[PDB]
């Protein structure tokens, strides 16, 4: 059903759930070499092997981002249709999210296995600045740090190949030109298959940020998408191979 070889979006249905895929090179200014994304109905995988790569942004850190996600990207004012997202944060009762990936690079590859979310003040915004927040969860790095600093560690449950684990969570907070939060588990895994509800995030990510001059009312902002894909690069990456595969996907959203 669905392929690209060049960045790009495509909405896609899995097991009955409508998707979005996007080859995102968001902070490439130019590359030379190959990139292949490609969903066959069962699965989702991703392929580069690229050189001759330059940031747009070198102050951004990290050169792309190719994903796949559920709702609507404020960034890119797309959804696919039949979507349940957006949704004010108040009304999630729960937000699971069951995935299986396994990832390979090159060893000295700034990379990482990211999911993350856009709140945003207004349903359809088509950005995001102060006043909303970006919240990233980080189930795998390589030689890759989240931005700004961090804070506090939170233990948030997670079902690891089927078995409840507790895991370690770094928070990173930076207050850029809209908030960022980044929950990076502490124990990375490269290969697996992980359950967890996006929930246990959100009120985290609440406590953390409720003293903040600029987020104002939390609960109230729209969780407008579940984006899930790996970062990699930085400014001093010139060539990048690496690649992953996703399988045995669901959600199951609760208002
Ligand atoms: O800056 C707009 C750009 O953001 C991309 O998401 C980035 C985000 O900017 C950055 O703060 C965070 O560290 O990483 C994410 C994912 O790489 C978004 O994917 C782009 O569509 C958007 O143009």
């Given at each position: 059903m669905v392929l690209m070889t060049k960045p790009g979006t495509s909405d896609f249905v899995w097991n009955g759930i409508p998707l979005s895929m996007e080859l995102n090179?968001?902070?490439?200014?130019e590359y030379s070499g190959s990139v292949a994304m490609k969903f066959d109905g069962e699965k989702i995988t991703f392929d580069a092997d690229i050189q001759n790569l330059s940031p747009k942004?070198?102050?951004?850190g990290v050169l792309g981002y190719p994903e796949f996600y559920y709702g609507y990207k404020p960034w890119e004012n797309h959804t696919a249709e039949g979507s349940k997202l957006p949704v004010p944060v108040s009304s999630m009762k729960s937000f699971s999210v069951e995935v299986s990936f396994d990832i390979h690079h090159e060893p000295s590859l700034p990379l990482n296995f990211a999911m993350e979310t856009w709140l945003t003040?207004?349903?359809?915004?088509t950005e995001a600045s102060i006043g909303d927040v970006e919240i990233m969860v980080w189930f795998y790095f390589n030689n890759l740090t989240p931005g700004g600093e961090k804070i506090e560690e939170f233990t948030i449950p997670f079902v690891l190949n089927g078995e409840s684990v507790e895991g370690t969570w770094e928070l990173w907070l930076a207050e850029w030109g809209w908030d960022y939060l980044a929950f990076r588990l502490?124990?990375?895994?490269?290969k697996g298959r992980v359950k967890f509800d996006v929930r246990h995030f959100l009120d985290a990510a609440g406590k953390a940020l409720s003293?903040?001059?600029?987020?104002?009312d939390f609960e109230d902002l729209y969780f407008t998408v579940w984006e899930i894909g790996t970062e990699f690069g930085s400014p001093e990456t010139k060539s990048a191979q690496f690649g992953w595969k996703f399988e045995n996907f669901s959600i199951d959203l609760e208002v």
């Open positions: 090179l968001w902070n490439i200014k942004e070198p102050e951004r003040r207004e349903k359809y915004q502490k124990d990375p895994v490269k003293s903040s001059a600029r987020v104002k």
